[PDB]
Structures are given as structure tokens and as C-alpha cells.
Design a protein around this ligand. Structure first.
Ligand SMILES: CCc1c(C#N)c(S[C@H](C(N)=O)c2ccccc2)nc(N2CCCN(CCO)CC2)c1C#N
Ligand SMILES: Nc1ncnc2c1ncn2[C@@H]1O[C@H](CSCC[C@H](N)C(=O)O)[C@@H](O)[C@H]1O
Ligand SMILES: [Zn+2]
Ligand SMILES: [Zn+2]
Length: 842
DNA sequence: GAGGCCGCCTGC
DNA sequence: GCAGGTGGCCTC
């Protein structure tokens, strides 16, 4: 007695009769109108949707199609969202008309044609500002990846326009994109139909193309004896090594024993579908036959064959396998090197997923035969880099070909000088970024040096990593902290974005940026960008997956102006230890991931400490010669890349801190075996290089939790070892080889694992910090063999810096420059994603 | 300026 | 209980 149709039906598709207008009590609804629905739980707020179709079902009565909006508080923004902002989402369903509560007005707030000149909002307007009091949307939202994007431009046909749901259309396109399909048929064999090409996840595969496959897809025919398993830890003299018992965990940080294998690689020989006795092919079960390629490490030459080889070198093999097309992880190029027109280096650097071979491998004879014969630019963005440091981020972007950094802002003079030495075309402001922005906003044209300040329209890309000081805690945010946030460098960096309105924006930070203050810093940062009208997303990347022998997880925020394509995060290139690759983020009990799909493998093997620095000459503790001979050619692929094509007669900055006599003696007594650290130190007297004697540590107290040695000796060094008893300021010992403070507080610091710890050749670096110190928190900084801390050059190599990359200042200045930097290989991978967006703009 | 010293929290 | 993560504040 309320719902009655207006007019007659438009179409009668079976048991549905469609209409264009319906009357509900005193209101009339038409296709395109927006309505509210009460949730089943009356406490929850109203649902909101657009009506895309109206019909009568001959069994279920009056129906409509609801394309739901998403409330801002249901996105990652949460309670920081504008109360009246909605977001488009790909969610819709059929619903009885009786569930409609009321008609509502929803406005599309489009960015203006002058959007890039509308910046200059107060930071209060950025963080807390709202709009006029009516529902509105401006962005589309991806709930799984936390991506805000410009609304899709999907258009209907002249047939479905009367019931066109954009969500239904995009979901149908996504299902079409995912499902594997055969395209062009080649020959009809008795049992199967052969195809020339097939498609999957938007990629075209043809006979002769290379394919990535999971390591589980096939085995190699090579027969091998079982490798010798890791030996059981032998007992030790508890009196001579009193702290060795603290290594009961049997876990080695920086170890590569549990890194996965990289992809199998094959060349498609056949694409085929089984044919029923009917004769039609079964096109839901597509199969491929491939020839297996061997990586050097897959031959009877084990892992050591990978040491010198190019990371994209393969061997042909005549072994074949059949796998499901569904198992293919991606398409790659595998070419015969001698038949390539260019040199292998120009080929290898010209594009992603490029491999080559020269020889073939015979598993049965364990020999290397020769393969059978049946195998055969846009203008750069003007970039402002804020908090530029010595320029690791700018270097990677320049390597990706997208960026000319014309302006850099860096308050610390040594890093600014380093940036200048590497960027002679750039204007480098050695200035507080807060001061510079105030000058520009006041209408100044030059800073106090006479340097021309960038103006609106000059800056097309903005990038930087702003440090966090006062809000790095994980506790709640209060009046003091939030005031400290409103005046923080993060907000200053966002103010640069609001003023200049670049095409692309990148904010990089430590991983914990995503969780600081219960993730409020992240949430407020995303809210600012959305308020400005930017598309944006966030994620966590592991630098080791992009080509360095270093675990370094970093938080990344990417934003793109309206009119641009929002970039994707780059797919991992190198496999890396899975414990170091925890990239997901929880925001208000919701788990967010990035678009990255390579979760378990990748095209290239992991980069190791050996790859990084096996070619550097031996130097001593305190080495200070700034210019020395390399004494030989680069040995690994990684070293060949970082040394460059041009011959380098001189190796620079292979210098080390001059550790004191005691610390030097400790380093000399750290064993070379992998996993060695302070817990392996002998409890002996040692005469030091300056005449000092290093004293023996003696156990003066009882640790019931830790127990007693094999021969009954105590294991405590302080009265604080008792539950309650305070620190006795006389049990502290000095000039001890085993550092007193480590057994003193080791019970609540995981036994200070890694301090005075050696790198291992097969492993990776711990995070490269600004000042390598064996008794710091990241203490695993000893050379694998030499009795010293890693050099400046070795730290720069762990960050993927080219050896030509200039640093400036004393040795602590240079360590700080290197330790603060974004690894160029990570920044290059990000830049190539931005490059795809530049080329795809239309 | 150096070296020693060493809390609090998250995610399992 | 384990592993990682955040460097900085005395004291010389
Ligand atoms: C694991 C090493 C470490 C580290 C490490 N790494 C840190 S980090 C530091 C901090 N104050 O907690 C920090 C936290 C957030 C933002 C910046 C710095 N603190 C530690 N404390 C122990 C007591 C000393 N007390 C002296 C103040 O300097 C600092 C706290 C310790 C330790 N043992
Ligand atoms: N107010 C401020 N204005 C400008 N630079 C600042 C600043 N406060 C700190 N800095 C600088 O900001 C930098 C943060 S580290 C950034 C490293 C850089 N992304 C790279 O890839 O090399 C440091 O070099 C520090 O000196
Ligand atoms: Zn729909
Ligand atoms: Zn004590």
C-alpha cells in the first residue's frame, strides 16, 4: 500500500520486469537517485547507495539494485574522516524496495580546472577542516589495498544503460581479467588442441615466450648426494667461555638458510588444452609444456656458481615439464645472448624481466654442451627533494629516468655538500624547510644566499623523508603530542605538498611510521592528502627485495594529483628471508596489504654480503686512507653494477672508525664462524695495544633464573639480578674483555644477540645505521673476517650506492649520510612505477 | 668528544 | 618467552 510503479516496463528479461520510476508513499524514485537503508542493527548508522535499476520479480516482488557508498569512517581514515564524505566502492547487491528508508542528496565534488593553484591552506584546514553540510564524494576507495583513486570512467552501452551498474561492470572486467583463456588456435592433434597464444591476468603469452613458475612447479633431473646437515653445537669450556650458554636459541640473525628459491624459468614450447572424445577442447584446464632453464646454482656446480655469474644468466636444458597455465607467475624474456643485436648490458638494463643464455647444461653427464640451434622517452619531472640528505632517494629516481632534482632542502651542511657534489645542476638550500616555506608563502623570491626559491608550477614532483622525533611513541596521542604533530616536519612536508601541488608525491619513513600513536600519524597524513584532493596509498617495502644485502623495511606514502594515475608499489625483484618480509599493516583491527603479489618467490636470487663486498681490499681498524687501489676487478654481478662501466683507478672512502684498544681486542677474539658475537668472547686477560691489560670478568652474584655453570661457577655480575634488590654500585667492573653491561642486563634484552657480531658472507646486513657501534642496539657490524667494523664504503655498498657516489665530511659525517639514505635500488623500483603512470596518462 | 650503558612496546 | 624496533642520555 505504498510501492507502485510509474508507467509500464522498459524490458522483460525473463522473470524480471524493469521500470524507471517508482512511487513510495510521498516520494518518487528514479534510476540514478541516492537513498538510505536502515541496517539490521538499528545502532549502526544508515547505509547509503545509488539506485541503478528497478524491477519487479515475478516471485519476489519489487526490487532495486543498490550500488553502495562507503562512509569515510569505514575507510583507513576512520574517525579522522570528514563526517559527510563518502567514497565510491565496488560493492553492490539486489535488494527489495521495502528496505529503502529515504532519498538523500549526494554531490560529486570534482577538482576544479585551477586545482593546482588552490593551495595555501592553513595546517588546521589540512588536519581538521571540513566542507559544507551535505553528503559528497570525490574519490573511489579500494578497501583491501587502502587506495584512494579518481572515480572510474567506466561507460555503459546503448543496451544496458537503463540498468548500468559501474560496480557490476568493473567486477565483470576483473573476473574476465583473472580467468586464464586461450586466444589463437594453432594445430589440432589427436588428443589435445594446440594454441599460439593465451592470456592470464592481462598478460599475453605466446609460444616461445619465457614464463616464471613457482619453485614447486618442477624438479631438475640432477641426482645429488644429501648435503651435510648443520652440525650439533659442541660443548665448550664454561670457565673459558662463560657467556656461551646464552646462545641456546640456535637462531642466527642475518642468515639466509631459510630464504626461498627464485622462480623456475621456462620457455613455452606448447600451449594446449585436452580435448574430450567429443573433440572440443576443455578450455578451463589450459596446460603448457616448457623446456626447463637451469640457473648456475641449479647445476652440479652448487651455490658457488652464482658468485661470479650475472643474476639474469641461464642455461638451456632439454628437460621438459608440463604444468597448468594457472601456475604461471608471469612473463619474462629469455634470449640467446649471441643472437641479440645489442650488448648484454644494454639489453639487461633496457627493461624488466630480461634473461639470457649462452650455453646448455646436460644433467646426465654433468657437463656444459652447447644449446641446440632450435633456440633463437618523456621529459623528466622537475623535482624538489625535501630532507634530501646526501641524495639516496634522488639518485634512485634519476636512475629510473623520471626525475631532474632541481631543488633540494637539507639543513645539515655536510649532507647538503654531498648532495651538491653529486648534483651540480641542482639548487641546494642549506635551510630549515619550515623557514623556506614561510619565505615562499610570504612572497619572497630568494633566500638569504640569493638562491631562487621554487614557485608554484616549478615543482612537478615532491619527495622526501621527514624524520619523526616527539610522536615516535606507540601510546595515545594527547594535547602535547598532537600540538607537537601539528608543528612537526611531517606536517611541514604536507604543507609543501598543499602549496606546490605536484603531480606526484612520495613520503618515505621508518616502518613504525604506520603504527606511531596507534596509527594516528599515518591516518592524519592520509586525511591531509585526501582533503587536498590527492589520490593516495601507503605500504611497507623491504629494501632487500629490490637488490641490496640488507634488511630495511620502510613505510611509503604515494600520492598522485587528480588527472594522474596513482602508481602501484613495485613487485619484489629478489627473494629475501621471509621473516624480514612482514609487510602488512593493521589499522584499527583491519589488515591492509599492498598490491604486491609476489609473496613467496621472485625472479632473482638474494644479494649476499659476499656479493656486496668480497672485492674490497683488506684494511685495518681505523683505516683512514681516502684513496686506495681496488687491487683487482669486480667479482660479482652486484660489484660490476656498483663500480660502473668506466674503469675506476681509485677506491674511495674505504675507511673505518678507529676503535679503542679494548674494543679492538674484543673484535680480534670474535670467532669467524657465522652467528659469532659477544657471547663467544673468552674470559681471559689480554694485553692491549697501548699497554693496558684487559681484565677477567668474574661472577659475583647468583642468577637462579640463569642458573650455574657446568663446574658450579656463578653467572651473575650484579646484586640487581635478585628480584627486587637494587643496583649495587660496586659490582660494576671495568676494562673487562667481556663487556660488563651485557651480562648485567642481558636477561631482559634477549641476551644482546648480535652485539660485537660478525656479518656472514652468505647472509645479509642488519639495517645500516648512522653510526656503526659494536655495543649499540644494532651491533652486528664486524667484518666477516677482518677484526674491524664495516667501512664507510661497505656501508654504502649495503645501501646500493654506486662507488662513484660522493660523500662529504669526516668519517662520522659520511656514516650518517649513508645510514640515513634511502637505498637507490629501492628508490629506482619506486620511480619505475611512477614512470609507468607518466606513460599511461591520457 | 668518546664509550658505556640500556626502557618500553609490538607481534608472535 | 623470543625477536625486532626505535637511538640517546650521562659521564670524561
Ligand atoms: C635496545 C637499546 C635501546 C634503545 C634502542 N635502540 C632505546 S631507543 C630510545 C629510547 N629512549 O627508548 C628512543 C625511543 C624512541 C625514539 C627515539 C629514541 N632505548 C633504550 N632504553 C634503555 C634505557 C636508556 N634510556 C636512555 C635514554 O637515551 C633509553 C631507553 C635501549 C636499551 N637498552
Ligand atoms: N628542518 C629540517 N629541514 C631540512 N632538512 C632537515 C630538517 N631536519 C632534519 N633535516 C635533514 O633531514 C634528513 C632526514 S634523512 C633523509 C635521507 C634522504 N631521503 C636520502 O635518501 O639521502 C637529514 O639529512 C637531516 O639533516
Ligand atoms: Zn552492481
Ligand atoms: Zn645492577
Amino acid at each position: 500500500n505504498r510501492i507502485s510503479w510509474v508507467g509500464e516496463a522498459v524490458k522483460t528479461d525473463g522473470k524480471k520486469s524493469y521500470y524507471k520510476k517508482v512511487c513510495i508513499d510521498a516520494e518518487t524514485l528514479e534510476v540514478g537517485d541516492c537513498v538510505s537503508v536502515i541496517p539490521d542493527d538499528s545502532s549502526k548508522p544508515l547505509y547509503l547507495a545509488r539506485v541503478t535499476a528497478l524491477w519487479e520479480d515475478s516471485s519476489n516482488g519489487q526490487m532495486f539494485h543498490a550500488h553502495w557508498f562507503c562512509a569515510g569512517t569505514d575507510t583507513v581514515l576512520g574517525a579522522t574522516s570528514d563526517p559527510l564524505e563518502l567514497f565510491l566502492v565496488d560493492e553492490c547487491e539486489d535488494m527489495q524496495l521495502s528496505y529503502i528508508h529515504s532519498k538523500v542528496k549526494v554531490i560529486y565534488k570534482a577538482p576544479s580546472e585551477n586545482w593546482a593553484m588552490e593551495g595555501g591552506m592553513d595546517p588546521e584546514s589540512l588536519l581538521e577542516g571540513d566542507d559544507g553540510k551535505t553528503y559528497f564524494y570525490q574519490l573511489w576507495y579500494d578497501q583491501d589495498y587502502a587506495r584512494f583513486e579518481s572515480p572510474p570512467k567506466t561507460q555503459p552501452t546503448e543496451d544496458n544503460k537503463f540498468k548500468f551498474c559501474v560496480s557490476c561492470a568493473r567486477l565483470a572486467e576483473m573476473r574476465q581479467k583473472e580467468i586464464p583463456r586461450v586466444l589463437e588456435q594453432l594445430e589440432d592433434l589427436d588428443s589435445r588442441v594446440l594454441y599460439y597464444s593465451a592470456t592470464k591476468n592481462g598478460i599475453l603469452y605466446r609460444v616461445g615466450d619465457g614464463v616464471y613458475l613457482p619453485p614447486e612447479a618442477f624438479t631438475f633431473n640432477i641426482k645429488l648426494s644429501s648435503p651435510v646437515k648443520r652440525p650439533r653445537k659442541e660443548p665448550v669450556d664454561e670457565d673459558l667461555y662463560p657467556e656461551h650458554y646464552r646462545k641456546y636459541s640456535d637462531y642466527i640473525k642475518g642468515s639466509n638458510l631459510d630464504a626461498p628459491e627464485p622462480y623456475r624459468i621456462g620457455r613455452i614450447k606448447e600451449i594446449f588444452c585436452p580435448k574430450k572424445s567429443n573433440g572440443r577442447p576443455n578450455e578451463t584446464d589450459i596446460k603448457i609444456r616448457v623446456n626447463k632453464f637451469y640457473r648456475p646454482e641449479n647445476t652440479h656446480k652448487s651455490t658457488p656458481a652464482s658468485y661470479h655469474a650475472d643474476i639474469n644468466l641461464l642455461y638451456w636444458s632439454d628437460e621438459e615439464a608440463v604444468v597448468d597455465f594457472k601456475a604461471v607467475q608471469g612473463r619474462c624474456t629469455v634470449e640467446y645472448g649471441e643472437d641479440l643485436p645489442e650488448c648484454v648490458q644494454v639489453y639487461s638494463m633496457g627493461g624488466p624481466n630480461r634473461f639470457y643464455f649462452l650455453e646448455a647444461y646436460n644433467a646426465k653427464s654433468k657437463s656444459f654442451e652447447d644449446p641446440p640451434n632450435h633456440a633463437r622517452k618523456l621529459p623528466k619531472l622537475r623535482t624538489l627533494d625535501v630532507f634530501s640528505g646526501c641524495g639516496g632517494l634522488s639518485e634512485g629516481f634519476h636512475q629510473a629516468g623520471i626525475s631532474d632534482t632541481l631543488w633540494a632542502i637539507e639543513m645539515w651542511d655536510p649532507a647538503a655538500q654531498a648532495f651538491r657534489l653529486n648534483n651540480p645542476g641542482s639548487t641546494v638550500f642549506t635551510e630549515d624547510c619550515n623557514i623556506l616555506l614561510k619565505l615562499v608563502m610570504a612572497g619572497e623570491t630568494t633566500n638569504s644566499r640569493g638562491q631562487r626559491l621554487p614557485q608554484k608550477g616549478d615543482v612537478e614532483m615532491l619527495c622526501g623523508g621527514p624524520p619523526c622525533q616527539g610522536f615516535s611513541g606507540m601510546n595515545r596521542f594527547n594535547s602535547r603530542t598532537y600540538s607537537k604533530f601539528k608543528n612537526s616536519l611531517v606536517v611541514s612536508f604536507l604543507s609543501y605538498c598543499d602549496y606546490y601541488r605536484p603531480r606526484f608525491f612520495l613520503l618515505e619513513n621508518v616502518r613504525n611510521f604506520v603504527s606511531f600513536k596507534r596509527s594516528m600519524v599515518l591516518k592524519l597524513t592520509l586525511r591531509c592528502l585526501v582533503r587536498m584532493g590527492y589520490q593516495c596509498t601507503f605500504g611497507v617495502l623491504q629494501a632487500g627485495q629490490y637488490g641490496v644485502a640488507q634488511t630495511r623495511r620502510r613505510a611509503i606514502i604515494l600520492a598522485a594529483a587528480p588527472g594522474e594515475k596513482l602508481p602501484l608499489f613495485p613487485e619484489p625483484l629478489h627473494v629475501f628471508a621471509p621473516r624480514a618480509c612482514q609487510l602488512s599493516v593493521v589499522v584499527d583491527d583491519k589488515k591492509f596489504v599492498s598490491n604486491i603479489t609476489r609473496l613467496s618467490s621472485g625472479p632473482f636470487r638474494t644479494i649476499t654480503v659476499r656479493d656486496t663486498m668480497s672485492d674490497l681490499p683488506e684494511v685495518r681498524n681505523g683505516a683512514s686512507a681516502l684513496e686506495i687501489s681496488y687491487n683487482g676487478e669486480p667479482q660479482s654481478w652486484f660489484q660490476r653494477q656498483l663500480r660502473g662501466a668506466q674503469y675506476q683507478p681509485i677506491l674511495r672512502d674505504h675507511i673505518c672508525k678507529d676503535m679503542s684498544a679494548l674494543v679492538a681486542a674484543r673484535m680480534r677474539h670474535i670467532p669467524l664462524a657465522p652467528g659469532s658475537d659477544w657471547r663467544d668472547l673468552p674470559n681471559i686477560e689480554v694485553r692491549l695495544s697501548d699497554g693496558t691489560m684487559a681484565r677477567k670478568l668474574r661472577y659475583t652474584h647468583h642468577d637462579r633464573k640463569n642458573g650455574r655453570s657446568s663446574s658450579g661457577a656463578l653467572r651473575g655480575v650484579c646484586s640487581c639480578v635478585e628480584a627486587g634488590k637494587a643496583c649495587d654500585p660496586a659490582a660494576r667492573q671495568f676494562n673487562t674483555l667481556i663487556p660488563w653491561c651485557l651480562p648485567h642486563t642481558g636477561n631482559r634484552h634477549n641476551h644482546w644477540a648480535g652485539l660485537y657480531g660478525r656479518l656472514e658472507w652468505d647472509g645479509f646486513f642488519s639495517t645500516t645505521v648512522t653510526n656503526p657501534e659494536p655495543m649499540g642496539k644494532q651491533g652486528r657490524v664486524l667484518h666477516p673476517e677482518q677484526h674491524r667494523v664495516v667501512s664507510v664504503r661497505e656501508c654504502a655498498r649495503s645501501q646500493g650506492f654506486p662507488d662513484t657516489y660522493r660523500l662529504f665530511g669526516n668519517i662520522l659525517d659520511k656514516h650518517r649520510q649513508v645510514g640515513n639514505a634511502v637505498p637507490p635500488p629501492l628508490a629506482k623500483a619506486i620511480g619505475l612505477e611512477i614512470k609507468l603512470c607518466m606513460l599511461a596518462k591520457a
